[PDB]
């Protein structure tokens, strides 16, 4: 991985880098050549000659003729000087722009090569690795490359060109002294390389810690609903805090090593100064070198050293970029075993429907010890329907996944028409099969767009036909924005049944040759299920169909039914034979806005948030002023020492006394090293602590918000993660070492100004008359940068949304073969910041050229005015070139200040957004302690005429009116059609939303009056399609009560009560078995049962089951229901179910249509009053 960061540089990028390097070399060798022309070195001082020759220079007119010639030669410089500046105005641009143009073109291509690779890996790779980190790798990690292959390289080459040109000019004039000085540069190289490797290693680890924090944040934000229901905000915050603390610990060490690198560089530069003076004194003692010659070398080898000292940060940035490019290119270079982008494979023109499963042995990559399938055999002829039945966790979804070739069977072969599916092209194979997953997942787009994912070239007529066949037409057209209605992420703004019909339509619209249904009627009502099964029965002969069901009514008419037992199919035949066979199937059947742009002082408000670190800042600013004012003060000291050296007395004893002055240079080097390290370290550590607390506060505020805040289409999971990372990563770029260099530069300007006024006079006016133009350049830059910051942030959250949406839902994306579509969407999202980067590149080039050229112009104007003033005789020739050094350093510091305004402009907008998110208080405040906390509750729930509509489609009334009353130790059953609002009442009892009209009572007390945390802790909830975190089984069960430490014994009791303890015991690592993202490393039944155990371990007073047996075998349903019935006494229970067997025993059943409470009563009462309930019970008859 050495020197591979530029893998994606084409010919245009190569010429950009080459011409930029040449321009950088030209711009660097300017300073060596400004001295080489003024290297004639024999004009010396006529006045210095005058102290010796005052008797000779007593003549008034001949001393004037000298002064007048001095003008002539001085203007001779200011001419050349101006020309030099003109040249800079070209070459400076040509470097920065081009290097930036070479970086933006590669960073843009890296992101597309990264994401493509992410979409190229297979399902086993996603199962093994933690993919929640990938999102940060896309946003933060690649960003660290952008700052290390840009114009920083150009400025590095500029400084090294300055250094080496000065050393070569020095070699031509004074060779020995030059070798003695150059013998130190290997130490600089060794130090810089060692510090660079250390810094790169630390950056790798810091990026890893940030990726882990991002994975935690993404997992929490995707399951925020279960987080809020169980009150788990503090534990997620603590996990985030631990990752942030590790990242801060790494960042502090990074700051320490970078600052120690800079300090060591400066120390060794001053040591080189001392060595040069000592060798020069020795040489003039041996008389081998003319004193003139010694100043020729000194004045030619001693500025590129400070150039290298200034170039150290570019080395740091490149090291950080190399450290960041590790994981990105490791993922890029990976090659899938099952390649879905390969063009080499069989693509049969005619395909019938014969499936073959011979001797299928398979174990998942994550759990190799556990065997799932062992000798599986299955023959599926064409036009036939083969149903898969058995206990939950048997391996039916595994077989359906093997059909799509998401995994390679370990033993045996899966084949179509006698051809191994390995030989057939992966994309072609996955394109000819339609799939409905067990809990179907949609994307955060319109209904029509979601259906269009199944097949791209579908007309509205075909979409409508598929929707009609899927029994989804009525609710779609009942919605405003019929096919343009926005569904939430993971289709969470539709009901479970509606989402399932949308997925069925998506699978049907691609006219599959092989149809795969994974319990496609799990969330449907008996009437909806009957309609859907009839519709798929009408068109069945054209395509073979494999179906998995726990509702055996759909299986009743299947051509062939296969039963699972021990990873093999034990029974195989039609309904008649299997009932005659008296086997597992028989038992299963017989079982019974803009906000005022950006406010000023937002960045000031962030810094004021970092007020506990005031000693750090005061120490840093004292060190900054000291080491900033040293450089002009060191220039004055150098001038005085040179004046002593050139006019040294005849004894050699005092030449050694100036050699004693060389120790003052070592003292200055040591003190500069201390001050540089101190200021850098203090500012870096303060910035790190500010960044850590800033991300902590932003995430804490995010967890505080209402559910209505998460349903907002701008607040998606990917958008939230991108905002969380970026809003704090942009403040960091203007609060660390950059504020330190700002303070150093303002101190430098002040010191240079003070030196200018005292030593000479009237050249200070020039130094003040120039600052406004550099300020104007800064302003004209800052305007464009401020606009682009808002635009880039807004459109970067859009790309983060796409990336997270694709990564989290990768199995659906692969099943639908939509990797190319998501790459295209990602690129289209990336397009705008690309052009912003190009414009920003050219703007930086222009600004840099202007600042440097105006520096040279200021030098030329200084010499012009100095010559004109020497014509007035007001001030001597020593001060004119001293104030020249002062103006040089001060104006250059002011120019370097200007390269910061873009960062300040981004930091102020990020600061404003961070302040806005932190102070946002919700209507239903989770963190609020105020509110009623009853000492005991009777256990009564009353929905006394509740009228509610969701705050995403507020025109639609979801609960037009319904009155419910619940007594302690009773049981409500909630039945009805899909979309009737059964889940809505449970979400209201959870205080996820607040009803407009009506009210909800707990023991006759308004729910708003009670404390939200207490109310949520008094009740336990199981949702329609449960979400399990990517942790151990016991950790997921222990999530039931976060206000105490749940015992392992209690976890085992809860697991046993939920009919899951057997499976967990059978697993290696037992309850410590790690379940994957969203519980996808378990089956639907096991995940549901573990969710039941989680809601049971807390022993709630109010139990809220929401289709808690939706994905469960009838034998598992019976056991779970009888266990629930044992504890029905002394426990209020509310049950939402579409399978009516678990409902007959309930104390009372309420049938709701479209949000109304029309029918209620016991099972006998509802069965007697023939109507909706009687029709639902007797659908199959
Ligand atoms: C900021 C400081 C610390 C930079 C220190 C590292 C430099 C020595 C690097 C940075 C940019 C690099 C250049 C960027 C890209 C290329 C293209 C590269 O061409 C390739 O793609 C590889 C060779 C080939 O196959 O032709 C040749 C080296 C070169 C000029 C690199 C040479 C090494 C450079 C100058
Ligand atoms: C031929 C050289 C050794 C003569 C001495 C030249 C010097 C002026 C020094 C000062 C800074 C040095 C550079 C500091 C930074 C680096 C990066 C470092 O290599 C890496 O990039 C290491 C990997 C990483 O970045 O983590 C060592 C080489 C190089 C180009 C150094 C080369 C030698 C340089 C130019
Ligand atoms: S003029 C202010 C500063 N120079 C000195 O303080 C100084 C003391 S003694 C001395 N310079 C000897 C006489 N100078 C040289 O030998 C010499 C050769 S080339 C050269 N100076 C170039 C033209 N000087 C500078 O660039 C320069 C900037 S500030 C400065 N000297
Ligand atoms: N990605 C995975 N990694 C590891 N183990 C898995 C993975 N997916 C499933 N398993 C396990 O392998 C077994 C097969 O479960 P599978 O999903 O095939 O069941 P199923 O027949 O679809 O049942 P259900 O009716 O519960 O949906 C189960 O024990 C399950 O926990
Ligand atoms: N978060 C949401 N935002 C907007 N509308 C929603 C949201 N959740 C549900 N809806 C809509 O409100 C209505 C209420 O449906 P709800 O989910 O309450 O039904 P349900 O009885 O739980 O359904 P099922 O039995 O299919 O699970 C439906 O029309 C649904 O599309
Ligand atoms: Mg399954
Ligand atoms: Mg529901």
Residue numbers in the entry: 34 to 625, 683 to 1271
How did the manuscript describe this experimental structure?
L335C in transmembrane helix 6 (TM6) and V978C in TM12 are situated at symmetric positions on opposing TMD halves, while L971C is located two helical turns above V978. Only after adding Mg2+ ATP to fuel substrate translocation, Pgp971 reacted with AAC-DNPT, but Pgp302 did not (data not shown). For Pgp971, we prepared the covalent complex in the presence of Mg2+ ATP and stabilized the resulting OF complex with vanadate in a post-hydrolysis intermediate state. However, in OF335-1lig, OF978-1lig, and OF971-1lig, TM1 swings out at A63, dilating the transmembrane passage and providing sufficient space for accommodating the bound ligand. Strikingly, along with the upward movement of the ligand (from L335C to V978C to L971C), the TM1 loop is progressively lifted and restabilized. During the last stages of transport (OF971-1lig to OF335-nolig), the TM1-TM2 regulatory loop straightens, and the substrate-interacting hydrophobic residues (M74 and F78) rotate and pivot away from the tunnel, which facilitates the escape of the substrate from the transporter. Although OF971-1lig captured a post-hydrolysis state, we cannot rule out the possibility of ligand release prior to ATP hydrolysis, when it is not covalently bound.
To address this fundamental question and overcome the dynamic and transient nature of substrate translocation, we tethered a substrate molecule covalently to specific residues along the putative translocation pathway of Pgp and utilized cryoEM to capture Pgp structures with bound substrate during various stages of transport. In conjunction with molecular dynamics simulations, our structures trace the substrate passage across the membrane and identify conformational changes in transmembrane helix 1 (TM1) as regulators of substrate transport.
